[PDB]
Symmetry: C2
Subunit: 85 residues, 2 copies
C-alpha cells in the first residue's frame, strides 16, 4: 500500500508484460535479446525506486552502479533486434 | 510450446514469483535486495537457456558474460540481507 511498494510493482508489471512477449519469441536468440532488454529496464526501474525511497547506503550505492551498468548492454541489443526484423 | 520458449517461460515463472515476493517487502531496501537477486537469477536462467538453444554467436557470448559477471554480485546481496532486519 506504500508508495515505494506501489512503485516497485509498477516496474515489475512493465517488466512482466515485456518478459512474456519475449517468451513468445520462437527464435531463441530474439527471445534472449527481447528478454534481456526487459530485464535491464526492470533493473533500472528497481534501482531508481531504491534511490528514491531506500535508506541504506550500501543498497543505494549498488542501485546507482546498476543504473550506469545496464545502459551499455541495452544499446547493442536494440541494434541486434533492429537489424534482424 | 517450443522447447526454447518453454525453458524461457520456466525462468520467467521463477523470476516473477520472487519478484512479486520482493515487491511485497515493506522495507524498500529489502525489496531492492530481494528484487536484484531475483533479477540476477532470472538473467542467468535466460542466459543458460540461450546457451542451450541459441545459434547466434554474439548472444551466446553475451550470455556467457552474464553467467560470469552475475555470479559474484548475488553474494554481496545475500550478505546484506542475512545481516539485516
Ligand atoms: Cu503488488
Ligand atoms: Cu504473468
Ligand atoms: Cu504470459
Ligand atoms: Cu527473461
Ligand atoms: Cu508459458
Ligand atoms: Cu503475475
Ligand atoms: Cu503478485
Ligand atoms: Cu524487479
Amino acid at each position: 500500500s506504500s508508495a515505494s511498494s506501489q512503485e516497485y510493482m509498477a516496474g515489475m508489471k512493465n517488466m512482466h508484460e515485456k518478459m512474456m512477449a519475449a517468451v513468445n519469441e520462437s527464435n531463441p536468440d530474439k527471445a534472449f535479446a527481447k528478454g534481456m532488454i526487459a530485464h535491464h529496464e526492470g533493473a533500472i526501474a528497481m534501482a531508481e525506486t531504491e534511490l528514491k525511497y531506500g535508506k541504506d547506503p550500501e543498497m543505494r550505492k549498488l542501485a546507482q552502479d546498476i543504473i550506469k551498468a545496464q545502459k551499455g548492454e541495452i544499446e547493442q541489443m536494440n541494434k541486434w533486434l533492429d537489424s534482424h526484423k
